[PDB]
Amino acid sequence: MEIKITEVKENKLIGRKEIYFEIYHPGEPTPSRKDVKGKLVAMLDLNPETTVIQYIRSYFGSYKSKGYAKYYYDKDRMLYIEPEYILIRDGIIEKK
Amino acid sequence: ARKGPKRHLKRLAAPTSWYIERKAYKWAVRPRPGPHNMRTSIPLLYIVRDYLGYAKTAREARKILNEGKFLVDGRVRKDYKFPVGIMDVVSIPETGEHYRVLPNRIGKLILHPISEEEANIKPLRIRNKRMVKGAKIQLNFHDGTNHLIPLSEKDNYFTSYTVLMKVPEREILEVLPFEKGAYVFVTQGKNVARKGRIVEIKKFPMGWPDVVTIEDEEGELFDTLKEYAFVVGRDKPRISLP
Amino acid sequence: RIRQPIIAVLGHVDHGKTTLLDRIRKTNVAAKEAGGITQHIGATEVPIEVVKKIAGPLIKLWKAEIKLPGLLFIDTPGHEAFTSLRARGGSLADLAVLVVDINEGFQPQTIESIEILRKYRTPFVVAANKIDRIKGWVIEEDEPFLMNIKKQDQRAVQELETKLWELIGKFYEFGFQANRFDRVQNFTRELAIVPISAKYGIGIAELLVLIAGLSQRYLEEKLKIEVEGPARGTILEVREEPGLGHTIDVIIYDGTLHKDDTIVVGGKDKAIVTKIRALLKPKPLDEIRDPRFRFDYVDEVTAAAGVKIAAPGLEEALAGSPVIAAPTPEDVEKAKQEILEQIERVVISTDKVGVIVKADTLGSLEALSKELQEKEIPIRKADVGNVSK
Amino acid sequence: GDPKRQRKKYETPPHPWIKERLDRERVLMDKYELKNKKELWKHETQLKNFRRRARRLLAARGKQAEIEREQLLARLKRLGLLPEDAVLDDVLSLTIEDILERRLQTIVYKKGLARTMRQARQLIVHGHIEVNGQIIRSPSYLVLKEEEDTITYARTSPFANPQHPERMMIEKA
RNA sequence: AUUCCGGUUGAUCCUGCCGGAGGCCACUGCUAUGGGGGUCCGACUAAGCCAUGCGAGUCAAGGGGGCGUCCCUUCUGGGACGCCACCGGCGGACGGCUCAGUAACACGUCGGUAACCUACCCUCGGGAGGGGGAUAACCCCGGGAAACUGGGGCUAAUCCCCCAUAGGCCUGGGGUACUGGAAGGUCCCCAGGCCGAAAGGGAGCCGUAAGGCUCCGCCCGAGGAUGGGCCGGCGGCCGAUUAGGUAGUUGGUGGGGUAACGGCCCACCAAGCCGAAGAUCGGUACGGGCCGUGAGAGCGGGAGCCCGGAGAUGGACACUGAGACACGGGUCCAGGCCCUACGGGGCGCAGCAGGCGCGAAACCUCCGCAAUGCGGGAAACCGCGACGGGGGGACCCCCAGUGCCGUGCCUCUGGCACGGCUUUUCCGGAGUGUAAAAAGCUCCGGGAAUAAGGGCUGGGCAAGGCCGGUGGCAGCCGCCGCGGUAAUACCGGCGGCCC
Numbered sequence A: 001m002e003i004k005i006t007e008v009k010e011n012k013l014i015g016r017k018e019i020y021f022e023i024y025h026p027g028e029p030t031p032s033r034k035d036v037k038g039k040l041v042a043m044l045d046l047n048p049e050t051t052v053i054q055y056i057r058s059y060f061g062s063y064k065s066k067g068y069a070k071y072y073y074d075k076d077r078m079l080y081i082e083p084e085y086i087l088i089r090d091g092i093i094e095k096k
Numbered sequence B: 001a002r003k004g005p006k007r008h009l010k011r012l013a014a015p016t017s018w019y020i021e022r023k024a025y026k027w028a029v030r031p032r033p034g035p036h037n038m039r040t041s042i043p044l045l046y047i048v049r050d051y052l053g054y055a056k057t058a059r060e061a062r063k064i065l066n067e068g069k070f071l072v073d074g075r076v077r078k079d080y081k082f083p084v085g086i087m088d089v090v091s092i093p094e095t096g097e098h099y100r101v102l103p104n105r106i107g108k109l110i111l112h113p114i115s116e117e118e119a120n121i122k123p124l125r126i127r128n129k130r131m132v133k134g135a136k137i138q139l140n141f142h143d144g145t146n147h148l149i150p151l152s153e154k155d156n157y158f159t160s161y162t163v164l165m166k167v168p169e170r171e172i173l174e175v176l177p178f179e180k181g182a183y184v185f186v187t188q189g190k191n192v193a194r195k196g197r198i199v200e201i202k203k204f205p206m207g208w209p210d211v212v213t214i215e216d217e218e219g220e221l222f223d224t225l226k227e228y229a230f231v232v233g234r235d236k237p238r239i240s241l242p
Numbered sequence C: 001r002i003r004q005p006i007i008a009v010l011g012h013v014d015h016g017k018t019t020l021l022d023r024i025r026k027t028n029v030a031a032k033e034a035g036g037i038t039q040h041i042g043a044t045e046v047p048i049e050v051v052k053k054i055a056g057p058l059i060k061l062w063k064a065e066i067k068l069p070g071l072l073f074i075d076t077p078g079h080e081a082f083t084s085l086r087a088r089g090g091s092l093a094d095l096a097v098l099v100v101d102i103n104e105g106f107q108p109q110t111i112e113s114i115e116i117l118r119k120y121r122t123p124f125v126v127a128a129n130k131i132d133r134i135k136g137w138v139i140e141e142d143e144p145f146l147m148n149i150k151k152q153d154q155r156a157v158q159e160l161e162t163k164l165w166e167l168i169g170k171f172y173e174f175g176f177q178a179n180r181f182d183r184v185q186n187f188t189r190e191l192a193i194v195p196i197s198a199k200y201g202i203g204i205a206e207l208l209v210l211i212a213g214l215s216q217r218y219l220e221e222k223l224k225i226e227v228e229g230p231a232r233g234t235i236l237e238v239r240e241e242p243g244l245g246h247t248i249d250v251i252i253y254d255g256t257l258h259k260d261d262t263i264v265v266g267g268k269d270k271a272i273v274t275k276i277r278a279l280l281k282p283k284p285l286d287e288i289r290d291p292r293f294r295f296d297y298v299d300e301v302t303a304a305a306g307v308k309i310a311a312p313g314l315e316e317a318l319a320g321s322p323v324i325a326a327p328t329p330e331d332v333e334k335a336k337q338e339i340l341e342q343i344e345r346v347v348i349s350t351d352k353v354g355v356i357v358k359a360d361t362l363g364s365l366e367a368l369s370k371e372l373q374e375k376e377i378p379i380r381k382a383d384v385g386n387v388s389k
Numbered sequence D: 001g002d003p004k005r006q007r008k009k010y011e012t013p014p015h016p017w018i019k020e021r022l023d024r025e026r027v028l029m030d031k032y033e034l035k036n037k038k039e040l041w042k043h044e045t046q047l048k049n050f051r052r053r054a055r056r057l058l059a060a061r062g063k064q065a066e067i068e069r070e071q072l073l074a075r076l077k078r079l080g081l082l083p084e085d086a087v088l089d090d091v092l093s094l095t096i097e098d099i100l101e102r103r104l105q106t107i108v109y110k111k112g113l114a115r116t117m118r119q120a121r122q123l124i125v126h127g128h129i130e131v132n133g134q135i136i137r138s139p140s141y142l143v144l145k146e147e148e149d150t151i152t153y154a155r156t157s158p159f160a161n162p163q164h165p166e167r168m169m170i171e172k173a
Numbered sequence E: 001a002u003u004c005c006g007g008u009u010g011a012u013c014c015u016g017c018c019g020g021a022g023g024c025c026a027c028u029g030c031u032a033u034g035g036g037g038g039u040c041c042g043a044c045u046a047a048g049c050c051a052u053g054c055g056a057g058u059c060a061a062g063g064g065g066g067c068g069u070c071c072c073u074u075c076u077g078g079g080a081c082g083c084c085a086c087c088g089g090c091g092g093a094c095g096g097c098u099c100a101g102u103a104a105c106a107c108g109u110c111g112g113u114a115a116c117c118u119a120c121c122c123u124c125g126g127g128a129g130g131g132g133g134a135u136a137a138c139c140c141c142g143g144g145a146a147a148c149u150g151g152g153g154c155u156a157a158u159c160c161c162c163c164a165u166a167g168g169c170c171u172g173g174g175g176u177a178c179u180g181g182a183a184g185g186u187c188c189c190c191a192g193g194c195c196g197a198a199a200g201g202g203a204g205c206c207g208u209a210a211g212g213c214u215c216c217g218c219c220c221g222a223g224g225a226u227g228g229g230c231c232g233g234c235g236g237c238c239g240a241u242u243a244g245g246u247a248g249u250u251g252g253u254g255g256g257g258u259a260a261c262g263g264c265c266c267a268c269c270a271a272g273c274c275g276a277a278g279a280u281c282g283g284u285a286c287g288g289g290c291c292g293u294g295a296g297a298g299c300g301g302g303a304g305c306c307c308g309g310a311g312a313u314g315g316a317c318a319c320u321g322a323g324a325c326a327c328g329g330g331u332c333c334a335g336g337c338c339c340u341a342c343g344g345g346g347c348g349c350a351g352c353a354g355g356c357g358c359g360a361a362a363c364c365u366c367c368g369c370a371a372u373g374c375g376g377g378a379a380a381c382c383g384c385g386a387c388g389g390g391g392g393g394a395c396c397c398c399c400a401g402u403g404c405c406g407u408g409c410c411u412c413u414g415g416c417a418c419g420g421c422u423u424u425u426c427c428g429g430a431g432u433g434u435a436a437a438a439a440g441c442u443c444c445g446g447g448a449a450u451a452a453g454g455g456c457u458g459g460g461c462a463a464g465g466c467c468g469g470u471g472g473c474a475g476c477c478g479c480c481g482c483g484g485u486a487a488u489a490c491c492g493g494c495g496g497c498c499c
C-alpha cells in the first residue's frame, strides 16, 4: 500500500491540523488503522499519542481508499474536543 | 401556532437567501430576534460551521463561540442563534481575517474579504427620524440600532441618507446625502447587487412607494424602489464592493 | 437446589377443599364464587416461613430438615362435570391430598379420584374433615389433634374411632392398607389419615409437617433441577385477558425461563413457535385465579413457579400440552419431535348442525360440551371468546 | 394534494400482439443478446426523448431556446452518436441501432475482448473489465466517446495475463 | 402512434350502444435468488373501547438544611469535597397525532392598521434610596382502607408587602420642533386628578486591610426584531319536484365594553338590507402548493411531504400566565368503565409500541441521544418514542443473477457427450464500516456448484386441423358464440405463443 497526502490544513481556533490522504493498494485488503497510523506518523514525524484517524473508506470498484485524520498539539485539548467514542475506537483510551 | 409562538423551523421552509442543503436533515436553526430581519440575515452557527468550515459539528462550533473568538461589529457574540446581516463585519482576530456580508447576484448572502483599515467602519442607512423627550432627535437605522443628536444638527440628517459609523465606539465620521449623482448599491429585488449612480426620482399618490433610476458603468439605465437603493459614496464608493 | 413440590387437592363436592386452602392462606375465597362451587383450577405458592410459623415443636420428632423452599398447592373442582380438570390435576402434581368427609362416607367422585391417582402413580395421604359435626366436641383456634383429643370425652373418641375404622375398612376393599398417622410406623406401603377441621384449624399442623416430611422419603432425587438448563413446564389453562390478548398460565418446573426466550408449545393441529413477550407473576400467598393484589411483571423466573405468559399467536394452544424452551433451530426440531409424542386427552365431536356455545376458558368449554353430550344435543361449534356478531 | 411518486423510465407497447412488431423486436433481441423486452424498451424510450426535444426546439425562438439547442447538440456528440459537425436536423435521422451500439457489452465485443456477446456480458458481470481505471459491472452502461479507448481487462483479473488459457482462445479469433 | 378492431342482414350501406386493446390506484390467487435509493404501510368501516411501560425537563455561580469523607486546631468548631430532597427561577401554549365539524373572510392572492398586543433578543438614554413579613425543608403528635390531609415549634432568599423618587394614563388651554401621500400621533409650556418601579443580588483574582478589576445579572423610557389579532377587493362545488327571505334585521344619533375598529352589546329615531346575474333552504365536503390521465383543448382526485384551519368521549364554563378557556392542568352535566373495609375515591392513547372490536383491507410491547434541532444552564453538560438506527412487509423506482468457451452428434432454434474456464450470487475467514451492531465495500479458501414461474392456445389477438376421455350431460363464454357419439372452442397428455 502507498500513501499520498492530498491536503494539509491548519486550524488555529481549535488547535489542530487536518490531513486528507489516499491509499493505493491493488490486490490487497483495506489497510488497518494501526498500519495507517504508523505510516502516517513516520511520513510526517508527528507524535503518535495525539493523532486520531477519523475514517478509512473503500469504494466499489476502486484500488484505492480515502482517509481523514487529525493531529492535536496538546493532549488536554484533544481529550477536551474529541468525543469519547472516537478515542475508544482508535485505542487511545480504554473503555469503562 | 394554535396557542402561542413558534420555536421550531423545518429545513424545507427556511429562508431562500441561505446557503444550506434543504434535504439533508429535518430541522434548521430558528434565529433569535435581533438586528436585521429574517429575509436579510443568517444565524451565526451556519457562518462558523457551513460557510468558513472551522467546525464539523454544532457541538464543537459552540465551544469556539463560547471562548470569544468571533466579533460582529467589534463586539463579542456568543449566541449561536444571533443573526448576522447586510453590511455587517465579521472579524477573527486570532487568524487576523475580516469579512463583509453582502448579497449575491442571485440574492444569497456571501462573505467578501476586506482590509483591516476598512473593517472599522460600517455604513448605516437612515430608516426613520423622530423627536424624543428633552427635544432631542433620535435616528433609527436600517439594522434597528439608534442614535441621538441635538436639536442644532437636525437639518443635516434626512431619511435615506447614509451615515458612516466607527465601530465598536459608535461615533459618527461622515454623512452621505441621497441626491442626483450619488453612488448606490442595490440590496433587494430583481436588480439586486447591481451598482451605479442616481439619475432621477419619481413619486406617486396615496402611499405607493417611490422609484429611482440608476445608470451603471456601461451606460445602461435600470429602475428600482427607493428603499432598495443603499448610498455608498459621493461619486466613488467609500467601501470595497465586488 | 430443590424446587417446591406440587400438591393437588382432590375430593367430592362440599368436602371443604377450597376452605382448607383459604385457611392456609388466611384469606376468604370460598364466599366469592357463585353457587359455592369452584369451577376453575388454580396454583398457589406458600412460603416456608409461614409453614414454620404454623408448625411448632413437632418438627423435632423427625430427623430431617425444613430446607424445602415452599409449597405449590393446586385446587381442583369436585363436580361431576369437570372430569378433565381432575385428570390434569392428578397427572401433573407430585403429591396428592384426598379430602373425604367422614359422615357421608364415599362418593363416586372419590372413587374416580383414587382411580386417577392409581393410574398416574401419585402417592397421597388421606384427610378427614367435618370433625365438629360430632356432638360433644370443643372448638379451639389452630391447635393440633394431639392437643385437641385430650379435651374431649370418651363418647366422641369412640365415635371417631368407629368412623375411621370404617373408613380404613373401605380403603381395604379398595385394596389399600390404611392406618392413622400417629398409629403407624411403616411409611412405604401404609398411608396416613389426618383428622382435620377446616373451620377451626384442628390438625392442620400435622398434615403440613407430614407433607413436608414425606416428600424426601419416597422419591427425593426427582426434586433436583439444574438452575441453568432450558425451561420445561406444562400448560394449566388458556384464557383471554384484557389488554394482553390470548395468554396461558403455566407451571415451570425445569430449568430457568427468561424473557424473549423462544418456546415450543403443542397446538391443536401442530406445534406452535413464538417468542415470549410478557412474563407475569402472582403475588405471594394469593390465588392465581383471584387477582386480589396487582400482578408483578418479572423479567425472568426460576423453577418451580406458576407464571402467566403473554406471547403472540397462542389462541390455538392446547390445555395440558408441555412447553419446552428452544434457543436454536435444532432445539426447536427436538422440541417439535417431543411434542409429536403427546396425546389429546379430550376431543370435541361437532355435528355441524347444532347449537353455538362460547366460554371464557377451554376447561369450562370441555365441561359444558360433556354435559350437553350427556343429554343427546348436537354441537355445531365450540371456541373461546365473547359473543360476537 | 399528493406528494411525489417515482415513475417508470420506459414505455410499453400499445398493443401486445402485433405480428410485425414482434418480428422486428425478436431480430434485435437475438442480435444484441438482451435479457428481456423491458431492457430493449428502455433504450427505445431514450431515443424518443431525444427526438421529442429536437421537434420542440425547431419550432422555438428566444434566448433560452438557443442555449438548450446547443446543449442538446453537445450532449449528443459527447456520447458518440453524432459527428462533430452535425446540425439539429441530423437528430431526426437517428435509429435504435445507433443507441444499442453504445452499450458496454457491444463495445467489449467489438474491441475483441470477447469472442461472443454472451461471453462479453459475463466478462462484465463477473468484474473482469475496467473503464478509465474503474470497474463497472452494468452491461447496459452507455460509453462516452472520450473514454472508449481506455477499456481493458482489470489489472487484478485472471485474464490480465497473456498466458491464461481462456484469453488465448479469445485471441485465436 | 393526433390509430382502431368484433357485434343488428340471406347479402349491403347507416345511426347507435355494448365488448376488446393502454395507463394509474385499493383488495386478492399462484409463485419468488440479490443489492441500492425514497417524502410507503389501522386514511376508506368504528373522531369505537383500551391493561402495562415510556412520550418534558433543567439550574448547586438564587436560598437555608440533612448525610458522608478528609484537614486544622479540635472538649466546641472552622474548613474543603461529594450526594439528597425542599423553597425559588425559567420551560411545559412549541414539538407529535387525527380530519369529526365547517360552503365560512376557512383558504389562495394583492393591499391596510393614522384602529392593536408581544416574555425571550438588539441599540441608544437613564435608575438601583429606606423599612417590614411570613413560610416549606427540619423537630413533636397525628387522622384515614386508601386517595389525600390536621395542629404546635423554629428559619432563608434573586420569595412576599410598604414609603419615597423616576415613570404611566385621562381632560381642559396655548406653542408649531418631527415623520408622512395625509395627523384623533410624537415634541415644548401651564392647570385638575388617578395609578405607581427596582435584586448592587451572585461568582473569581489582586487585596494585610482599605477597595478595585473582570464575569453573570435587577427596574424605567424610545425604537426595532420575532410571533400574532383585526379589516377589505378579487378567485374556486351540486339541486327550482327548494321562490320569496330577514325584524338587532339594514342604517343613524348617544353610550358601554375590548389590546383594538365594529350591532360586538344596550337606549332612542327611521324603514331599510338580500334576491331568477339564483337569495333562502337542502346535499356533499377541511383549503392550497400539487397528483393521475390525455397530441392538445380538457376530464377526474386532493390520506402520506410543506404551508394554513380545526379537535382532544359529547355539551357548556373558569383559574394562572407575555401567550390557553390548555391532549400527558381544573369545574358541572350526559354517557361508559375501575377500586373500596361500603364511609368514599378515581380513568378516557385521534403520542410510540401492544391488545380487543369492525371489516375485503394495514408491522416490534426493539437500541441511542453519536448526528439534526428544542428547553434549561456562566460553562462543561443533562433530557427528549421529536429525530436518528435497526426488525416485519411481492409499497414505489433503479441495477443484476439463475453460467461461459471449443470440438463432435442429434429432431440442428435447441438437446446430449467430451475437454477447459469464471465466481456476480452461495458457504467459511481477515480488514474497514457503526454510538454499539447489522448491511455494504476491499482481500483470502472451496466449488457449476445454491436459484423459474404465471397466464393463454376458434375469431378479436401472437400461438395445434395432434392424441385419449365426455356426449344439449358435465362444463366454457368480457363480446361474438362452443358442446345433440367423428369437439382445432369443455377435461387431461404432448407440443407451441406472450411476458
Ligand SMILES: Nc1nc2c(ncn2[C@@H]2O[C@H](COP(=O)(O)OP(=O)(O)NP(=O)(O)O)[C@@H](O)[C@H]2O)c(=O)[nH]1
Binding pocket: C011, C012, C013, C014, C015, C016, C017, C018, C019, C020, C030, C036, C037, C038, C076, C077, C078, C079, C129, C130, C131, C132, C133, C197, C198, C199, C200
Ligand atoms: N361445620 C363445618 N362446616 C364446614 C367445615 N369445613 C367446611 N365447612 C362448610 O361446608 C362447605 C364446604 O364447601 P367448600 O369450601 O366448597 O368445599 P370444597 O372442599 O371447596 N368443595 P367444592 O369447591 O367443589 O364444593 C362450606 O359451606 C363451608 O363453610 C367444617 O369443618 N365444619
Ligand SMILES: [Mg+2]
Binding pocket: C017, C018, C037, C038, C075, C076, C077, C078
Ligand atoms: Mg373448591
Ligand SMILES: [Mg+2]
Binding pocket: D001, E302
Ligand atoms: Mg390535503
Ligand SMILES: [Mg+2]
Binding pocket: E008
Ligand atoms: Mg335492422
Ligand SMILES: [Mg+2]
Binding pocket: E043
Ligand atoms: Mg395516516
Ligand SMILES: [Mg+2]
Binding pocket: none
Ligand atoms: Mg380508527
Ligand SMILES: [Mg+2]
Binding pocket: B002, B003
Ligand atoms: Mg399544542
Ligand SMILES: [Mg+2]
Binding pocket: none
Ligand atoms: Mg368529513
Ligand SMILES: [Mg+2]
Binding pocket: E196
Ligand atoms: Mg410606589
Ligand SMILES: [Mg+2]
Binding pocket: none
Ligand atoms: Mg375539495
Ligand SMILES: [Mg+2]
Binding pocket: none
Ligand atoms: Mg401498532
Ligand SMILES: [Mg+2]
Binding pocket: E361, E362
Ligand atoms: Mg394492504
Ligand SMILES: [Mg+2]
Binding pocket: none
Ligand atoms: Mg388443452
Ligand SMILES: [Mg+2]
Binding pocket: none
Ligand atoms: Mg393468428
